[PDB]
Amino acid sequence: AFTVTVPKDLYVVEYGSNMTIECKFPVEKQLDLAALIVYWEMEDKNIIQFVHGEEDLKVQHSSYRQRARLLKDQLSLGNAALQITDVKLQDAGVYRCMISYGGADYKRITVKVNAPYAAALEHHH
């Protein structure tokens, strides 16, 4: 059936860097964008909502606005790729990509963020 595949289940990124996380779905010939549904979330916090042919930024979290973008060019090739710029300590956790394209499946990705003492002290408050 329809199964989403993740090439890498764990990402290790440095503080302030940019990370692009990848999950893949099977594409037959072209993209019926009127049926593609991509939901990117981490810890019950929406990052990006792809419904119809565009993004639904009505539920995107503020912490991920101006930092999160799904590579629309890669959706043709069946790669729902989410990019987060300036990864911070709070971007560590379990991410979930849910894709609906005829079928439906989801896969989880765990992100670990290394950081220097200064940035870590900031998270400790």
Give the residues lining the site for its own copies (CB under 8 A). Answer: 1, 35, 37, 39, 44, 51-52, 56, 94, 98, 100, 102-106, 108
User: Nearer to its own copies by C-beta: 102 or 116?
Assistant: 102
User: Nearer to ligand A1D9R by C-beta: 71 or 98?
Assistant: 98
Q: In which element (H, E) is residue 124 found?
A: helix 117-124
Per rule CB under 6 A, is residue 99 in the interface with ligand A1D9R? Answer: yes
CB of 69 to its own copies, least distance (A): 20
* Contact of residue 108 among its own copies, ligand A1D9R, none (CB under 5-8 Å per partner type): its own copies
The candidate with the shortest Cα–Cα distance to 70, out of 92, 90, 94, 53, is 53
Q: Which stretch binds ligand A1D9R (CB under 6 A): 62-70, 78-86, 95-103, 112-120?
A: 95-103
- Measure the CA–CA gap between 125 and 123, rounded to whole angstroms: 5
What is the DSSP track for 23-75? EE----SS--TTT-EEEEEETTEEEEEEETTEE-TTS--GGGTTTEEE-HHHH
